Design goal:
part of a larger assembly, 6 chains, alpha+beta, 3-stranded antiparallel beta sheet, transmembrane helix (chain B)
Chain lengths: 133, 96, 133, 37, 133, 133
């Protein structure tokens, strides 16, 4: 009698422990997703006025709400769709203009283009520009 | 045994749960528990007319309030017909 | 009894998790395609009237609906097949004429030739022209 | 179970490392311009 | 008693299944080998007589039995060691002469130099020549 | 009673065997490290006196105790920090002078620049120079 009961209880433990592993490995496997777009940008700086123009050259199309500008510029931390009034997509030939904070850049100051995912749990730097005097 | 996909949009606070692959599940045996508006309701209640959960089936819940906070978990839970057994199919934690 | 059941449940988990990875990697590998055509263009500007002529010099043949003109010109954002009445392909010797917005260009104004893919999810700049006074 | 998880983590590393190279090479290629009259 | 027996049978299955994978992956890894030589050749055609001369210019030394000529010529499908009586290696300055099938070539007719591996399971085109009138 | 005891003993075996694998794989993964520096050197030979000068052109900075000279020269097997009195780093513009063993080189004699890691379990050839008459 006792061997059969021991077998029953061992099977009962096995089922629960297998479920506990399954949940963990499934949750671990669900975590990987959401690659970032690949594109190229052109940075054009004018020293007289301090204006920097960023233009989309070639690559994939990007939502204008997923891209923000970070750097010592007046429009710091705002998305591409905010800097211009009515953008919705970023395709080749699209450009924005920011101005250096103060009235000019200093050597060694960097401006970045940053992509953020819809959930907000991933980010990447698309391109960066350093002023070298 | 099945796999689910959690898809969260921070702008609106909507979380979409989709069946990826695995066995077919009765829609009355699965409920959602977490800090969401549709808390404690079965999969067959959240959408009007579901009967089975097969690959490609999805529901949409909304974060309670209007957004999630880091460290908040949402679970998918299976309950047996007699009601004397339960299991967690999958869980999702928001990590900012 | 219990070891065999544990093996069964582990295999059942493995199959599902492998399928989940397979879908993701296949979708990731399907994303890369659709290279852009390589060709050369000639820009011919007349200051008296403000007319700029763009001619295909040499290279591959391009659909006239895949190419658009972007710049401070009257025909801004229209395809090559719209600017002339009945174009279908762009081969050597094919030309269009646009006019500078207003009646003349200003130094530092750029006009681009842009290619867009059939799905609309990729773009490239074929050639650009800057007016340098 | 473990081989699939190893594959997942290797792919996750590969994506980040590829992005890191891409940024650098794009910035390097943007530097050349502006010929003189 | 039964758990130990279950463990024994699971190990027995594991050993066989591992051997089955090992054979397959080892056979798959053994398949890649046998790169082709890199060399340059000079094609010299005389229209009066229809004779085409192929000379080794520079590069590695090649067995004369691994190279054959394919094209609309009289010596079609024969090896380099057959076209001349006593060749053994192809080094710089070595040449053969074939004749255009009929008595002359036609525009658009190609003659190739082809390398074949010792096992016969790989081939490559070393160089080709097209008559363009 | 016996099934539970069998389960206990199987778990006890599993724990030890897992630890044995873990140690081995961790030790295997710890082995890979210590890449070598990348730099360029200039070799300048004077036939009248037999003196060969080695200068650092461009690249990373290298510890002078990690680099030694091997070849048919008087200073054979000595480090860069020994050949000159007081070197500590090798940056651009740094040079040493060795003399050909005997009083002159012979055609086909090679001189190498060699990097050795701190543990002494890895080496690489930075650059080599062959005298070709």
């Amino acid at each position: 009698v006792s061997p059969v009961i021991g077998v029953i209880l061992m099977v009962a433990i096995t089922v629960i422990l297998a479920a506990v592993i399954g949940t963990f490995v499934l949750g671990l496997g669900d975590q990987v997703s959401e690659t970032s777009p690949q594109a190229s940008f052109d940075f054009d700086y004018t020293n007289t006025s301090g204006n920097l123009t960023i233009t989309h050259e070639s690559g994939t199309s990007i939502d204008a709400d997923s891209v923000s500008i970070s750097g010592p510029v007046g429009d710091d931390g705002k998305t591409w769709a905010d800097i211009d009034g009515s953008a919705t997509e970023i395709t080749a030939g699209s450009s924005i203009t920011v101005t250096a904070n103060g009235s000019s850049f200093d050597s060694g100051e960097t401006v970045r283009v940053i992509w953020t995912s819809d959930s907000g749990s991933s980010s990447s730097t698309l391109q960066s520009w350093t002023y070298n005097g």
